[PDB]
Amino acid sequence: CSAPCPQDWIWHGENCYLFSSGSFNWEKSQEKCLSLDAKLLKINSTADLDFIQQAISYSSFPFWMGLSRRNPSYPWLWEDGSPLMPHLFRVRGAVSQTYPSGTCAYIQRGAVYAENCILAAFSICQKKANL
Amino acid sequence: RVANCSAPCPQDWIWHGENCYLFSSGSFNWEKSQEKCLSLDAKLLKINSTADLDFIQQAISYSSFPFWMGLSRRNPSYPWLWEDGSPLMPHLFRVRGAVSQTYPSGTCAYIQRGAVYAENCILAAFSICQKKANL
């Protein structure tokens, strides 16, 4: 018998969620989730979105999620190469631009926005809960 | 009925050390915040150890918001008391700011950016509930 999640994480449904300790570019944030046996946030449902917004409701920080694209001719995809399911959210912000290191999505103050991947943000990591 | 593998804390709470913590998702007055914790068979935050303080300081570092704790002072002639009736010990913090007889329902304490302040209990803030972890 092990706890579903380590101390300091939030257990929700099948997963465990953690806010990153620091603010880094998307690539570094991805590496830091991987080091914790985790991945960047993947939103599969509006229930997941509502859970995350309630968890970040007290923060004004931007948090990277695992969604990115090279440029606007590419669809948004999660780190695992799966697609963004429809009717979850509309990515706002910098959606028409091409950045040398791609465009990445973050959640901030109740909405999802596109940004240049080289800029810094906090991030949310997630991993499967031990059930 | 007897659990196969009891989790330390319920879903949506955060486990740290001996306790479970539940951060609110909105701002409410102290009485409504107290009621919410009681409804869950829990209580408002009681920072009683260095482990509790270190955890809360890190968790609230993502926020500029105030979070009510379970500490209040009926009127300036009375002491600060936790919801359990115990006194405020001087080890971890003092409550900064004003206590006033003009406040209709006493003065309450909140933690904000690591420090603890006094405020009129009828004002709205985020809050934190706590209960013992099932270890």
UniProtKB/Swiss-Prot annotation, chain A:
Q: Which organism is it from?
A: Homo sapiens
Name of the featured protein: Oxidized low-density lipoprotein receptor 1
Print the domain comment field.
Answer: The cytoplasmic region is required for subcellular sorting on the cell surface. The C-type lectin domain mediates the recognition and binding of oxLDL.
Disorder: Independent association genetic studies have implicated OLR1 gene variants in myocardial infarction susceptibility. OLR1 may be involved in Alzheimer disease (AD). Involvement in AD is however unclear: according to some authors, variations in OLR1 modify the risk of AD. While according to others they do not.
Q: Describe its PTM?
A: The intrachain disulfide-bonds prevent N-glycosylation at some sites.
Q: Where in the cell is it found?
A: Cell membrane; Membrane raft; Secreted
Tissues where the protein occurs: Expressed at high level in endothelial cells and vascular-rich organs such as placenta, lung, liver and brain, aortic intima, bone marrow, spinal cord and substantia nigra. Also expressed at the surface of dendritic cells. Widely expressed at intermediate and low level.
Q: Which cysteines are joined by disulfide bonds?
A: C5-C16, C33-C125, C104-C117
| Site location (Not glycosylated) | N44
- C-type lectin domain residues are 12-126
According to the record, mutating H87Q results in: Abolishes binding to acetylated LDL (AcLDL)
Full-sequence range covered: 140 to 270 of 273
Its function, per the record, reads: Receptor that mediates the recognition, internalization and degradation of oxidatively modified low density lipoprotein (oxLDL) by vascular endothelial cells. OxLDL is a marker of atherosclerosis that induces vascular endothelial cell activation and dysfunction, resulting in pro-inflammatory responses, pro-oxidative conditions and apoptosis. (Microbial infection) May serve as a receptor for adhesin A variant 3 (nadA) of N.meningitidis.
Record note on what altering W11A does: Abolishes binding to acetylated LDL (AcLDL), probably due to inappropriate homodimerization
Extracellular side stretches: 1-131
